[PDB]
Design a protein around this ligand. Structure first.
Ligand SMILES: CCCCCCCCCCCCCC(=O)O[C@H](CCCCCCCCCCC)CC(=O)O[C@@H]1[C@@H](NC(=O)C[C@@H](CCCCCCCCCCC)OC(=O)CCCCCCCCCCC)[C@H](OC[C@H]2O[C@H](OP(=O)(O)O)[C@H](NC(=O)C[C@H](O)CCCCCCCCCCC)[C@@H](OC(=O)C[C@H](O)CCCCCCCCCCC)[C@@H]2O)O[C@H](CO[C@]2(C(=O)O)C[C@@H](O[C@]3(C(=O)O)C[C@@H](O)[C@@H](O)[C@@H]([C@H](O)CO)O3)[C@@H](O[C@H]3O[C@H]([C@@H](O)CO)[C@@H](OP(=O)(O)O)[C@H](O[C@H]4O[C@H]([C@@H](O)CO[C@H]5O[C@H]([C@@H](O)CO)[C@@H](O)[C@H](O)[C@@H]5O)[C@@H](OP(=O)(O)O)[C@H](O)[C@@H]4O)[C@@H]3O)[C@@H]([C@H](O)CO)O2)[C@H]1OP(=O)(O)O
Ligand SMILES: CN1C(=O)[C@H](CCCCN)NC(=O)[C@H](CCCN)NCc2cccnc2Sc2cccc(-c3ccc(C(=O)O)cc3)c2CNC(=O)[C@@H]1Cc1c[nH]c2ccccc12
Ligand SMILES: CCCCCCCCCCCCO[C@@H]1O[C@H](CO)[C@@H](O[C@H]2O[C@H](CO)[C@@H](O)[C@H](O)[C@H]2O)[C@H](O)[C@H]1O
Lengths: 238, 297, 289, 239
């Protein structure tokens, strides 16, 4: 599956923050949507999710135009979103968070929903907190429950927003292992992040957007040896 | 889906009921300060306490507005409404879950209006303390000096004159005698429709009873519509705002709606068009405007 | 520069709040007056003059409330968007910022001193003459369509009524003469001069003290808005409004409860500054904790 | 000259967030207060500034207790604060932002104040944008106006909160020169930041606050070789 995105555009206060941002993503592949802060990497990311309405552009997913659909109508097509901020259901237990979205899945029955919930808890090692409220778990443990909850909806493309946000260097490997696990599960991952040192370490194909347009494209090795990216975003030393 | 539905409904229901408890307690305390003017004080606390169901009945439309603002505001500010859309739960489904919470308040509004308010109102009047000079039945004008629910100096005039009959002790019925002094607004729907049907069978129903009838039949629809406006504001203008700002705005919509429904109620008694236009005016427009803010997502 | 920065902000947002409260406090009364006018108990063409004459009465309460709310919105904004961390971090406390607004509060005190002493009585004097002129309406002036109106020895029934209260239809008049026709066409206001020296009487002792010690609620609204304005950036600019409007309103409710207990010669006029001093000292102590 | 912090402590919701945090910072020296996220490095920083009440311990500045002084009273003692979030006076001109704090200074007359403002604008290359509002400037230029404003108060210690927050790698070096310039100005700088890799590149003495207590101390080279830090904070391979 391919999430073709063509000629995105959006203006704010009569100023075009995003001008002709176009990139392509495939299932089972990590793609990093990077760039200078405020240059349109966040806004172009949100127009893929659906939070920000698209002024101009075309977002197809395997000959399925997802341009006119809202946030939820795209999510039913197989697009996932993991907010940077804490988005766990505070008053629902960790097992109820995953079970809340599993009941939304129409591809299962009560018998296999409990089996799917059990293995999702075991996959992310949150079984020991399956009965604790979502508001009373560690930030590292909660984020694993948010990803497990997102995987309960069976997404084809998981768009991660700032995954390495407030993550210590000891636990940056844990996030990379999670993101690598999503790729091995057949889910394409779109990462937008301010921490470009580690986002350029897991992504297979990165898009640098500056001044509202994509200024470079390719593997992280090609991104580093790009004169425009080095001059504008990464700097002479990196 | 049931676990998500219970979480959205219970969170909003506790916010609608929590605001209801607070708003009634504040209005009982504020009203108690006022009556104290015309003072015994205890005789004045029971009169205000007995009026609590009637203060409760008039708070339900504004407690449901603030309840949906605070109930969904807690969900919105915690980024919980974003992850319901991220899995395939529409905006109109989340609104439908909040309406389920408001439907408890609508049923509570019916119970107070039909069986609770008309009783505690009568008990309140006694604490503070049978129609006299009652004045048309088609072509006949009837004046009775004293009328009892169980007559004195009757006077009936027939119409060109035929007979002016007088007695010392006709379509008048004792059942509706006790409803004559009661304001049309205060009458319960069971009492109002029965009284209007009685007047319409023998005379013309005044426009102050038509307005009271329309202000009651459109009371459940103003509670649901005002909830939908609250939900659309959370997904629209009041998204990412503080909890205090949402509460402040929820108070401006509540007063704006109470003033608009008060003013357009009065305007229906001075202008030719039927009170249905003035009562169902804002309700239809807020539903259309509220449903548009939901279409903008 | 920091004093002019605050005065411009407080004046701008206090005038917005004052105009917002005037639209709400007297918009509700204007609608209620319109409700009386819709039943014929008040001329529909004068209810805008009633609002004009009750401007000083409501603005007597809104001005301390608008200044108090406008003070906390400004001081809330400084806290929310981190302009207070760089003002405290530069040596300028919150108490010092509230002391830069004493010249502004004095202007608002003088303004309300004009309202309380002069325009509130003058507005209430003209309103009392006007309202008493609307209490004499009787007979066909109070008529309502499809209803019987009895005023003394008169009983009037009109089958229809125009948008204006003229051109009645299906008129029934009773005394005994029966006529049927198809068509038919206070110390609160006394000038201060009087209560100026006429003390030693609970009536004036309560009113005149209410006019002299009344304007000093602006100062209390200044040092109590400074005390109750500390709010976290994530909490919001409006977080401490509703909790602290009730703390301010508890002062006014106490002052109305003192005006009455003086009028009944039970408390004495000395309790006006005492009520303000207790709230003044409590606010000063809380701002310095 | 020597800001001394001893035995800081603070309990939130019956949980001791900070337990026995003590570090020393001298004037003209850059000190980085690092550590795992939520381990008390942020709370211990705030007790130094004054944005949270120290439940236990003391703060000294060259034989002058500052524990009992509020945030504004320490600022008169020469301690500055630079919030991570946008703290510019939004509706004030950038020249007025620096001037609003220069008029606070008592040892500067009108003429001496206009000069200081002129040279403060030139030092941070914002004299071209000195006539624009605080809220209508670039993110990079706004922070340069907040540091020029902070220097107008003439601090002896500057407590920077997340200086490398939301900063592109091109503009990280720009902040390095600013912090290096602050040290060259004789002003000690205390830095708390999540970006440990770049914070360790300017600080000459770093403190690692884990589980509420200081577990490491010394130059960034000594922090990296510490086996206790690399087990809890930095991880096996960090450079
Ligand atoms: C030193 C100090 C210096 C400074 C000092 C200052 C001085 C003090 C003040 C002096 C200047 C004031 C001059 C004055 O006078 O200010 C009077 C009013 C102000 C008094 C202030 C007292 C001090 C308080 C200090 C507070 C400081 C903060 C006017 C007047 O006097 O009003 C009097 C008027 N009273 C009111 O309106 C209440 C007044 C009271 C308002 C006071 C509280 C708010 C004020 C401050 C707001 C601050 C917001 C920031 O509301 C209103 O003003 C309109 C509503 C305004 C709401 C604004 C809210 C804004 C919120 C925005 C969102 C954030 C009264 O109405 C009658 C009934 O009508 C409705 O009932 P019905 O529908 O009929 O059943 C009301 N129902 C209602 O309101 C409620 C309705 O059911 C609706 C229910 C649903 C809404 C409520 C649910 C939630 C409630 C609680 C929420 C918190 C009933 O309310 C009552 O029962 C009492 C009841 O608690 C009222 C409601 C509860 C309190 C109100 C809270 C509202 C809050 C909103 C959200 C926060 C009320 O009983 O008629 C009198 C004349 O009637 C008579 C007579 O008896 O003589 C008999 C008539 O027949 C006729 O004959 C008439 C004749 O034409 C002339 O004689 O005469 C009028 O007097 P008159 O003109 O002199 O004759
Ligand atoms: C009975 N009072 C009034 O007539 C004031 C007068 C102010 C508006 C008109 N100028 N107005 C009212 O009461 C009317 C309702 C009465 C029917 N119209 N609206 C609520 C209203 C308007 C203005 C102030 N309070 C109210 S209701 C209220 C609120 C808080 C406390 C109290 C209270 C309760 C009990 C006692 C006691 O037992 O001694 C004392 C005070 C009250 C009750 N109101 C009072 O005691 C005052 C006392 C008062 C006399 N003149 C004044 C001029 C300015 C301010 C207040 C007064
Ligand atoms: C702004 C909220 C923050 C805190 C506020 C603290 C106090 C709030 C003040 C509320 C003012 C009360 O409002 C006052 O209620 C009393 C209730 O007896 C009303 O009183 C009215 O109805 C009663 C009930 O039959 C009559 O007996 C009375 O003659 C009539 O005037 C006043 O018309 C109204 O002005």
């Amino acid at each position: 599956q391919t999430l073709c995105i063509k000629h995105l555009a959006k203006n704010y206060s009569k100023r075009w923050v995003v001008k002709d941002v176009s990139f392509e993503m495939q299932s089972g592949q990590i793609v990093g949507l990077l760039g200078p802060n405020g240059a349109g990497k966040t806004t172009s990311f949100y127009m893929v999710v659906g939070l920000v309405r698209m002024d101009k552009g075309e977002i197809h997913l395997d000959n399925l135009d997802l341009s006119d659909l809202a946030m939820h109508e795209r999510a039913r097509k197989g697009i996932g979103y993991l907010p940077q901020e804490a988005s766990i259901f505070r008053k629902l237990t960790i097992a109820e968070n995953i079970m809340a979205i599993l009941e939304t899945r129409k591809d299962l029955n009560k018998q296999q929903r409990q089996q799917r919930l059990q293995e999702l808890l075991n996959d992310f090692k949150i079984t020991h907190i399956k009965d604790s409220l979502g508001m009373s778990v560690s930030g590292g443990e909660r984020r694993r429950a948010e990803i497990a909850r997102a995987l309960a909806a069976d997404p084809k493309f998981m768009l991660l927003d700032e995954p390495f946000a407030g993550v210590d260097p000891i636990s940056v490997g844990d996030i990379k292992d999670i993101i690598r696990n999503l790729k091995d599960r057949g889910i394409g991952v779109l990462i937008t992040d301010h921490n470009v040192r580690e986002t350029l370490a897991i992504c297979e194909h990165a898009y640098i957007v500056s001044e509202g347009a994509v200024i470079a494209e390719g593997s992280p090795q090609d991104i580093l040896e790009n004169e425009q990216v080095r001059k504008v975003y990464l700097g002479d030393d990196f | 889906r049931r676990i998500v539905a219970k979480h959205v409904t219970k969170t909003t229901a506790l916010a609608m009921l929590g605001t209801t408890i607070v708003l009634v307690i504040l209005q009982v305390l504020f009203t108690y300060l006022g009556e104290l003017s015309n003072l015994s004080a205890w005789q004045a606390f029971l009169y205000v306490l007995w009026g609590a169901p009637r203060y409760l009945y008039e708070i339900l439309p504004i407690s449901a507005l603030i309840g949906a603002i605070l109930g969904l505001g807690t969900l919105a500010s915690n980024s919980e409404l974003i992850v319901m859309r991220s899995v395939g739960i529409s905006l109109w489904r989340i609104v439908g879950w909040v309406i389920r919470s408001a439907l408890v308040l609508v049923l509570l509004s019916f119970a107070l209006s039909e069986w609770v308010v008309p009783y505690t109102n009568e008990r309140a009047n006694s604490v503070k303390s049978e129609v006299r000079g009652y004045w048309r039945e088609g072509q006949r004008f009837i004046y009775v000096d004293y009328a009892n629910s169980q007559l004195k100096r009757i006077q009936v005039v027939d119409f060109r004159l035929k007979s002016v009959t007088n007695a010392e002790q006709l379509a008048l019925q004792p059942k509706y005698v006790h409803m004559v002094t009661i304001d049309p607004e205060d009458l319960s729907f069971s009492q109002l429709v029965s009284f209007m049907n009685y007047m319409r069978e023998y005379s013309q129903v005044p426009k102050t009873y038509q307005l009271a009838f329309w202000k009651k039949v459109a009371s459940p629809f103003a509670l649901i519509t005002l909830v939908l406006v609250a939900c659309s504001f959370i997904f629209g203008p009041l998204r990412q705002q503080s909890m205090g700002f949402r509460l402040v705005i929820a108070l401006f919509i509540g007063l704006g709606f109470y003033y608009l429904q008060d003013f357009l109620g009065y305007a229906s008694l001075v202008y030719n068009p039927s009170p249905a236009w003035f009562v169902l005016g804002p309700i239809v427009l807020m539903f259309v405007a509220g449903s548009y803010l939901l279409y903008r997502a | 520069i920091i004093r002019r920065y605050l005065v411009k902000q407080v004046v701008s947002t206090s005038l917005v709040v004052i105009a917002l409260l005037t639209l709400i406090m007297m918009g509700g009364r204007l609608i209620k007056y319109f409700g009386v006018a819709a039943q014929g108990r008040l001329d529909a063409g004068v209810l805008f003059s009633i609002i004009g004459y009750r401007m000083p009465e409501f603005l007597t309460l809104i001005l301390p409330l608008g200044f108090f709310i406008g003070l906390m919105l400004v001081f809330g904004r400084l806290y929310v968007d981190h302009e207070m961390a760089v003002l405290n971090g530069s040596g300028i406390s919150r108490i010092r910022l509230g002391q830069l607004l004493i010249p502004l509060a004095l202007v608002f005190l003088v303004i309300q001193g004009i309202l309380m002493l002069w325009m509130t009585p003058w507005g209430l004097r003209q309103f009392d003459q006007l309202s008493s002129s609307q209490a004499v309406r009787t007979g066909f002036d109070l008529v309502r369509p499809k209803e019987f109106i009895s005023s003394g020895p008169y009983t009037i029934y009109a089958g229809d009524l125009s948008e204006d209260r003229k051109n009645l239809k299906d008129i029934f008049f009773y005394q005994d003469v029966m006529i049927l026709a198809k068509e038919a066409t206070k110390v609160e206001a006394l000038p201060s001069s009087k209560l100026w020296n006429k003390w030693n009487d609970p009536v004036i002792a309560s009113e005149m003290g209410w006019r002299v010690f009344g304007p000093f609620t602006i100062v209390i609204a200044l040092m109590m808005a400074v005390a109750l304005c500390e709010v976290s950036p994530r909490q919001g600019r409006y977080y401490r409004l509703i909790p602290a409007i009730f703390i301010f309103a508890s002062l006014i409710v106490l002052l109305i409860a003192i005006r009455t207990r003086i009028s009944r010669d039970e408390l004495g006029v000395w309790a006006y500054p005492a009520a303000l001093a207790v709230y003044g000292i409590a606010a000063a102590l809380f701002s310095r904790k």
